[PDB]
């Protein structure tokens, strides 16, 4: 098991899903089509912002 | 593949694959029947000759 973490804007939360096309999903972080595992996302406005 | 996302494309393409695969199965299992109705005729002609 290896975990990957990063901070993204709320407008690209859905782009983490495999098969999504976009500026961030194609140029920053893309998941494989037969991706195994899953992600955890939340609005951490208190700390990051 | 060029119009739909890959997350459901495998599901989408599966029922297209089984459609052709099942159709080929129907043709071959009927072609064997027509062989039997010919294999019977071949033996009849062989006895006739």
From Swiss-Prot, chain A:
Residues 9-11 are annotated as: Integrin-binding motif. Binds to host ACE2. RBD also interacts with the N-linked glycan on 'Asn-90' of ACE2. Cleavage of S generates a polybasic C-terminal sequence on S1 that binds to host Neuropilin-1 (NRP1) and Neuropilin-2 (NRP2) receptors. Interacts with host integrin alpha-5/beta-1 (ITGA5:ITGB1) and with ACE2 in complex with integrin alpha-5/beta-1 (ITGA5:ITGB1). May interact via cytoplasmic c-terminus with M protein. May interact (via N-terminus) with host bilirubin and biliverdin, thereby preventing antibody binding to the SARS-CoV-2 spike NTD via an allosteric mechanism. Attaches the virion to the cell membrane by interacting with host receptor, initiating the infection. The major receptor is host ACE2. When S2/S2' has been cleaved, binding to the receptor triggers direct fusion at the cell membrane. When S2/S2' has not been cleaved, binding to the receptor results in internalization of the virus by endocytosis using host TFRC and GRM2 and leading to fusion of the virion membrane with the host endosomal membrane. Alternatively, may use NRP1/NRP2 and integrin as entry receptors. This is Spike protein S1. The lineage of its organism: Viruses, Riboviria, Orthornavirae, Pisuviricota, Pisoniviricetes.
UniProtKB/Swiss-Prot annotation, chain B:
Changing residue 47 to I: In strain: Gamma/P.1. Changing residue 2 to A: In strain: Alpha/B.1.1.7. Subunit of the fusion protein that is processed upon entry into the host cell. Mediates fusion of the virion and cellular membranes by functioning as a class I viral fusion protein. Contains a viral fusion peptide that is unmasked after S2 cleavage. This cleavage can occur at the cell membrane by host TMPRSS2 or during endocytosis by host CSTL. In either case, this triggers an extensive and irreversible conformational change that leads to fusion of the viral envelope with the cellular cytoplasmic membrane, releasing viral genomic RNA into the host cell cytoplasm. This is Spike protein S2'. It comes from Severe acute respiratory syndrome coronavirus 2 (2019-nCoV). The gene is S. The chain holds residues 981 to 1029 of 1273 of the full protein.
């Amino acid at each position: 098991v290896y975990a990957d973490s990063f901070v993204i804007r709320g407008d690209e939360v859905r782009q983490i899903a495999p098969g999504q096309t976009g500026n961030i999903a194609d140029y920053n972080y893309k998941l494989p089509d037969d991706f195994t595992g899953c992600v955890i996302a939340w609005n951490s406005n208190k700390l990051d912002s | 593949f060029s119009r739909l996302d890959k997350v459901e494309a495998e599901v989408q393409i599966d029922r297209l694959i089984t459609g052709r695969l099942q159709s080929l199965q129907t043709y071959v299992t009927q072609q064997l029947i027509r062989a039997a109705e010919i294999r019977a005729s071949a033996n009849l002609a062989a006895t006739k000759m």
